[PDB]
Amino acid sequence: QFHVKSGLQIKKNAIIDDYKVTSQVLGLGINGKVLQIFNKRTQEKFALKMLQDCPKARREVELHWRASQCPHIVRIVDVYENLYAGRKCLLIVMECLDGGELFSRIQDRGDQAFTEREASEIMKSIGEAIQYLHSINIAHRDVKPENLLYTSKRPNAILKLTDFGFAKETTCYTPYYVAPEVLGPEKYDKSCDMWSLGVIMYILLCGYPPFYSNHGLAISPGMKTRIRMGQYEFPNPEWSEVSEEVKMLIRNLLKTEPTQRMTITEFMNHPWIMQST
Amino acid sequence: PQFHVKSGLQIKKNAIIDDYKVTSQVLGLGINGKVLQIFNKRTQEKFALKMLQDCPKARREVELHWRASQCPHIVRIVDVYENLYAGRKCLLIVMECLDGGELFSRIQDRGDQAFTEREASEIMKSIGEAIQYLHSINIAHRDVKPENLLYTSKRPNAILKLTDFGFAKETTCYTPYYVAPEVLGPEKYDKSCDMWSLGVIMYILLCGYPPFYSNHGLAISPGMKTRIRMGQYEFPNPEWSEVSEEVKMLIRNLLKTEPTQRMTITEFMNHPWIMQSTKV
Amino acid sequence: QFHVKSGLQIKKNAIIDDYKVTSQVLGLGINGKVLQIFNKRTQEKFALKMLQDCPKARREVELHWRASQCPHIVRIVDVYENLYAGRKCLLIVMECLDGGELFSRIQDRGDQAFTEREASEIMKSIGEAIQYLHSINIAHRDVKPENLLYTSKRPNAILKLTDFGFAKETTYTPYYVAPEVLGPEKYDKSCDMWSLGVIMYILLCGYPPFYSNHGLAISPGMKTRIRMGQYEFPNPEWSEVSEEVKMLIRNLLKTEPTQRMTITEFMNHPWIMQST
Amino acid sequence: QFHVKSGLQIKKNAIIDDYKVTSQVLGLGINGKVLQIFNKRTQEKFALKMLQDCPKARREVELHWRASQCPHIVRIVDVYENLYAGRKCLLIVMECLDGGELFSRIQDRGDQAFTEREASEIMKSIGEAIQYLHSINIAHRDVKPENLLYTSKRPNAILKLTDFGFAKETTSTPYYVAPEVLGPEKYDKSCDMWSLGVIMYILLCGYPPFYSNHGLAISPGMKTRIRMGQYEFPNPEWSEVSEEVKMLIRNLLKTEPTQRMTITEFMNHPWIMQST
Amino acid sequence: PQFHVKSGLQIKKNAIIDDYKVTSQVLGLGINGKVLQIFNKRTQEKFALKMLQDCPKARREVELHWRASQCPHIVRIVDVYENLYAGRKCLLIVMECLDGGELFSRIQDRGDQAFTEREASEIMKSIGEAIQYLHSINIAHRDVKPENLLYTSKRPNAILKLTDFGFAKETTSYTPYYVAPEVLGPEKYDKSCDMWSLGVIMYILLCGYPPFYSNHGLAISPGMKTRIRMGQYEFPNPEWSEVSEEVKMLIRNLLKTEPTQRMTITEFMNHPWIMQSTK
Amino acid sequence: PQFHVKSGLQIKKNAIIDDYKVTSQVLGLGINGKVLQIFNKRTQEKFALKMLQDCPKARREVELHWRASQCPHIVRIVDVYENLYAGRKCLLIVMECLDGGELFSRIQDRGDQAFTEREASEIMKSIGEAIQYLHSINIAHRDVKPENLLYTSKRPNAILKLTDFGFAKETTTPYYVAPEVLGPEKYDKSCDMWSLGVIMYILLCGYPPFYSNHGLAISPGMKTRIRMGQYEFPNPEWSEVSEEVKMLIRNLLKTEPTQRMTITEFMNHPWIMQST
């Protein structure tokens, strides 16, 4: 169900005319740091992402804007094109997400990890952001708990997808019978986002990832070949009481062949995900 | 024919629904999009909305229509919006309403009767004013046909306006006084197809039927294609008996199969038969 | 002992020497209109498709000829190469299919729709035409009710696939060579399988799995529902429908063409072989 | 208007099975000599053009065949593809044109030349062959007295266009589509119109509008006179010649091909129309 | 119009100062170089010298001009020298002197009075003779204007001569009697721009002002440009009232915006209004 | 030298005549367009308008001028409009007025008298401030000359400002990275350094270091004297001129651009800094 949304109007006035820009770093993005800023008129707190103008920065702003129209993606308040040291730069003003990352909520749990009902609620809210992106032909390509931020510390807080630094747009017949591959032959794979959901889901349940380096390295040749081969297990200490329904859902998202992988529509209609209502 | 400084196109980014109430009543069907009926939320005034999915062809239609819009004989653009729908950008052209019906309708209403040389000269002058403006700003409409010329109102003082820039195309070291046109701006003869269309419309106004058609009611047939390529048409005596040598020769010059042999819009607008209905 | 079919012999004499060509339009094809003609000697009625000679017309005639050798594809009687208006043209003489299209038989049923046994018999006869094409490396690419015509109005009438206007040709130790090593294919046959899934859905309920909500021919919503695989089996009509046929439809309506069911798997499915 | 014509069926049997091929040369074409042959069964005399098979020979046969369907172009009886010295060759069997070339009837008249009435009739029959070719998108490109032969010596003989050695195909909202939008011309039919202007001039006085002053075949002066459009109507011969035909010639001898008269305009000109 | 055997161009290599006295008095300014006043050392006679730096464009101007020089209506080249000056090769074109002033001066001197149809047809006929020669030898001048047409002397029997081949371009890269022009030589450039220039000069001769100009006295304006492309000009009634429809139709045919619709030089030279100059 | 956050260029689309009264009084002539006198309709304030037809070179002038405009030594851009005229897009640059005259007018008014080392260093320092800004933001003006340096007012507190970006061009471990590794230069800023050397020479004596002996605009001799580096400091005028400024001129008039002095070295030279 889609509606008529407004287009992006890039403001050209200096951002300092409207906002007080502090040097408090709220976070670090793929293509730029996120600073804490304040509206000069309302005194309201906002987050500012600073990108040097270039084709990759123009893509991030453009794709984030189209996605922003969804309650599960971090809202863009304004976008400014300003000059600094004779170089153009894009300044994205976004809403504040003070509830912390999903990475933090995961670390705070530790070895305790989450229940199948707690994990299905988290996965359903991540899946709502992915279903929106995929429905508007956008693959996030960097879905991880560090990029999913809570709006507030409250128990009614919304989990929001952020950082479109790696995002990519993924795009003579009778309408009723036209096959999907005939309509839009895919430029990029959304299926990499499905693999990320499988990785996050596995972590939510036991507290560790399905693939890692045995000696705590960031990446190792062994970790790479285990990913390529699909070499992972559900260790018995933590995975003992976990249902074979969620074990099979993870198996379908961690399929090494992207065309064998589960789609976002299938994931959002899975009983284990829909249990949350 | 004097030019002035006109404003550039400022595409509005706010959602069109903030300013207008968009109805689903289809006012007409364009080359690249349907025209719907909308209402200004503040003034309650009725407007027409053309919806195009953003792409290079849609950007061309909006850009060329805007430059042409600056003429009283082309449908006026009130505003242009760039909005999102289904995660895709789209251009929404708000235009004035043309409730007087198409010139095609006024043509079927006349049937076998057709129009007089004074009535046709009236109509052809107003189409020619729209074409003279486009050609003067290096734009070839490329789809000049009665289904695209609409009347502003049903009144007898209504203006005939050119619409739909779905096929429009832009057509573009010496002493200024003496420089030949081909030296200034070399063009690929896109404008001359608009001159051919005037010849076809002129022929239909004077007799009720077209110079070229398929004998067995087909939409297009190989025989009809060869008749256009060869320049095989006639002025059947029942209807063309009373028609002057002057307008028959004007039609012969617009229906020249060789585009370089065809009459220009300046020559057409200065032809005595077209100037006969000119209020000096 | 040695099973071989004859090649296509394009006749060059004027078609009017052998047939009386009427202007009664029997139907409208992708690349040409079908006319009603009569054999001058036998007075028998035939259908004539007229194509202007060109590479696309030569492809339609060539692929339809190879397919014609199957009882489930409209038979070609003769092919003529004649001149008209100084242009070469291919005139395909075919058998008459007076039983009406499957589109008509579907519309005539309306909300009543078809039983699981009636639909499986229709699907099995469509599948026989597709299995033949795929076995000779031809993808039809326009499989829809409008291109499936019945031979006669009788209850023993055969459903035949027509119009090869979008058809396209799709093309170590022998025992162990994998299919992708022998003939690497474009992935054009799988769109025919999607078409079977759509026609099967329409048969069991009377409406398609994907349509524009506001009756449009095509809408951005309809496009994204196809790409996402957004369809359901509404409970009023799909209440008593078996989960066997629901699973068959799910496998043909897989958005990923490589995940889709092959014609061989479809023809060996118990619900399709239920017919016998 | 146009009708359904038969296509070309190239015979593969040896031509000597059906005809006796004599060595009497009937004429010399652009790409081959025309020999005198006889039907073995009927003893009837025919003309045979021999071309070595190649793309240019295939073009001549193909374009001549499409044109042959007109009473003003030399009729093709049969076309054979045979082998000689291990090379394929096309043998075109045509009807005999024993009435002599238009070149001969011109030379035989000499200084006497033709009347405006006689020249109008000749020009109308040449124009009928050109109107057919141009209507089917073929430019002959070698229109000249030597290529226009009479069927017989009788006064009711038909003048026929021959030799497609230089002929070339000129191509790849309905009511309002301009000609240049339909078929943008690959070649110029315009040069055949220039040739009609030259022949018409020769018919009225006995000499051409452009020639080399020192009897040469071609000279730099003759070339610049053609490019400039430098010709006149000398008073002894063109004194009593009407300004109607002088204006017709001026319109066909326009140096700018797009300014030149079309075949439709030529065939509807009162001076040409007067014959019938 | 017949042609004869002319001698080729022999570029002299001796220093020009061996044969001529070169003064610094500038006689005029050309597209590619200034025209100086020189004197033949032996005969003491007055000559004009164009100095071009040697390069492919200069070699083209000399080559093209040389071919055209073999005509009484084009400024004659007396000699061409290839010398070294400032360590660079250069071409020095010695031409005859045209002391009668430019046609531009004769036009300015008349002012509002302009020229009669008899006077204008004599001027136009002499310009047309230079263009007919160039077009016959496949050369388009491409800068035909009153400033490039100079008179031989101040006398009333003076000949008008075409000068400056700075923009000139060569326009070229079956049965003889019947071969069409487009089959012989298909165009490399169009001569028809020269025909447009004749139409403009003819309009100025008959009335005193051009058919196309900038309304605010600018050298060139977007309005002037679109008036040219469109073919937007008129024959204002004060001046064009008594002007014949024969010469107005001649101007209309030369100012056709479509070059293929435009009149050829042969048609122009055989037009009764142009031929009237010799009854 | 510190940089700050500046606003980007917002090209206005409304007709300029809605906000300004455009007069035909020509204030000056630029590289790509004439500068006219205009008045703000609301404030009645006087402004300068440069009119350029939209094209890549015009878009470059506006874009580079805008980035440079952020410096007090470059003519300020008030607004930029994109309007239509004769169906063609055009860029209308509204700038502040510089009514104090060009540096050129000041140099001509001095004549043979010339300027002392102290006032010539003051002029050079203010030109160098505009060049230091451009070079710091990777822009080479490429047309630095007294005609393009205008005074804001006739007052004694007037600022000398650089104008006309008609020839301007963009020229593009942290502690240890060499400049050539960071930004390898696309064009050359060093031609602006040569221009400062020429202007400095003129200020001190009244004539340029390179000129045509026979008063020509440009001559082959003048060209080879520039390429060779053939100039001198004639004794009448350059007798009491310091060897410090003679050496500064020698370093800016180095024929090899890589041997030439940078803007940072020029701005830190004692003779330039003497002004304070």
Ligand SMILES: O=C(c1ccc(-c2ccc(Br)cc2)o1)N(Cc1ccccn1)c1ccc(N2CCNCC2)cc1
């Ligand atoms: O990288 C990880 C790792 C553990 C938890 C997480 C983790 C990663 C992202 C998120 Br968001 C949230 C958790 O990553 N490794 C590999 C490794 C090897 C050697 C030294 C360091 N690290 C890992 C470490 C310990 C375990 N176990 C100890 C507790 N009992 C069960 C198994 C499993 C994997």
Ligand SMILES: O=C(c1ccc(-c2ccc(Br)cc2)o1)N(Cc1ccccn1)c1ccc(N2CCNCC2)cc1
């Ligand atoms: O299509 C047309 C047609 C007639 C009028 C118009 C027409 C088209 C667009 C506009 Br906007 C306005 C009129 O089109 N045909 C061909 C055709 C033939 C058979 C069946 C359907 N159509 C046509 C019909 C009759 C004639 N006549 C012959 C001469 N005597 C008068 C009648 C001419 C053309």
Ligand SMILES: O=C(c1ccc(-c2ccc(Br)cc2)o1)N(Cc1ccccn1)c1ccc(N2CCNCC2)cc1
């Ligand atoms: O287009 C179709 C349509 C219905 C049936 C078919 C159809 C198509 C091909 C064949 Br072969 C045979 C049937 O198409 N629409 C959309 C539409 C909406 C508005 C106006 C026109 N069209 C449609 C309409 C109603 C339903 N409902 C039926 C009862 N349950 C709830 C949904 C479903 C689809």
Ligand SMILES: O=C(c1ccc(-c2ccc(Br)cc2)o1)N(Cc1ccccn1)c1ccc(N2CCNCC2)cc1
């Ligand atoms: O070529 C021809 C020529 C004459 C007749 C024909 C001719 C050509 C094709 C056909 Br099919 C039928 C006749 O061609 N020349 C040139 C030429 C010049 C000198 C020597 C040989 N040839 C020619 C000869 C005489 C005249 N004159 C006739 C009387 N008035 C003065 C001019 C004109 C042209």
Ligand SMILES: O=C(c1ccc(-c2ccc(Br)cc2)o1)N(Cc1ccccn1)c1ccc(N2CCNCC2)cc1
């Ligand atoms: O440029 C010219 C021009 C007039 C005459 C000539 C001229 C040019 C080349 C030659 Br070689 C010989 C004469 O040029 N302009 C334009 C212009 C407009 C405004 C200010 C400056 N210039 C001009 C044109 C027409 C008129 N008139 C209108 C019609 N009635 C008579 C007066 C006046 C001036």
Ligand SMILES: O=C(c1ccc(-c2ccc(Br)cc2)o1)N(Cc1ccccn1)c1ccc(N2CCNCC2)cc1
């Ligand atoms: O062009 C110049 C010139 C002198 C001053 C300027 C000048 C240039 C730019 C600015 Br901003 C401001 C002044 O230009 N010439 C050559 C020239 C010669 C003849 C006629 C025109 N031009 C020049 C003239 C005289 C001298 N001198 C030699 C040394 N003793 C004093 C006189 C030097 C050069």
Ligand SMILES: Cc1ccc(-c2ccc3c(ccc4sc5c(c43)NC[C@@H](C)NC5=O)n2)cn1
């Ligand atoms: C009190 C308080 C605490 C935290 C925050 C907060 C922190 C980070 C972001 C944010 C809003 C948007 C975005 S976007 C983005 C971000 C952030 N952080 C880095 C990564 C995930 N990438 C990105 O693009 N709000 C606000 N207020």
Ligand SMILES: Cc1ccc(-c2ccc3c(ccc4sc5c(c43)NC[C@@H](C)NC5=O)n2)cn1
């Ligand atoms: C009461 C009432 C009756 C009719 C109309 C009316 C109908 C169609 C259009 C129109 C205004 C602009 C345009 S533009 C355009 C159009 C139309 N129609 C289809 C085709 C010709 N193409 C186009 O671009 N106004 C409005 N109100």
Ligand SMILES: Cc1ccc(-c2ccc3c(ccc4sc5c(c43)NC[C@@H](C)NC5=O)n2)cn1
């Ligand atoms: C009495 C009677 C009633 C109907 C028919 C009848 C109608 C359509 C076709 C047909 C035979 C072959 C083909 S082929 C073909 C066709 C048809 N129709 C259009 C589309 C589907 N495309 C095609 O290629 N027979 C014959 N006789």
Ligand SMILES: Cc1ccc(-c2ccc3c(ccc4sc5c(c43)NC[C@@H](C)NC5=O)n2)cn1
């Ligand atoms: C008694 C008798 C005398 C002459 C002829 C005769 C001579 C030439 C041709 C001909 C028939 C066809 C063609 S075709 C063709 C031809 C000829 N001649 C040469 C050139 C013009 N080129 C061609 O293609 N018949 C027949 N019978």
Ligand SMILES: Cc1ccc(-c2ccc3c(ccc4sc5c(c43)NC[C@@H](C)NC5=O)n2)cn1
């Ligand atoms: C007393 C007196 C007054 C004038 C002249 C005089 C002036 C200019 C030229 C000339 C001879 C040849 C050429 S050629 C040429 C020229 C000239 N001028 C500039 C332009 C038109 N371009 C050129 O190439 N004679 C001679 N003597």
Ligand SMILES: Cc1ccc(-c2ccc3c(ccc4sc5c(c43)NC[C@@H](C)NC5=O)n2)cn1
């Ligand atoms: C009363 C009064 C007197 C003078 C002026 C005045 C003169 C020239 C310019 C100017 C403002 C900007 C620019 S920009 C520019 C200019 C000028 N002049 C030509 C050259 C240097 N190039 C350029 O780009 N103001 C204004 N008001």
Ligand SMILES: [Cl-]
């Ligand atoms: Cl490891």
Ligand SMILES: [Cl-]
């Ligand atoms: Cl027809």
Ligand SMILES: [Cl-]
């Ligand atoms: Cl919908």
Ligand SMILES: [Cl-]
């Ligand atoms: Cl000769």
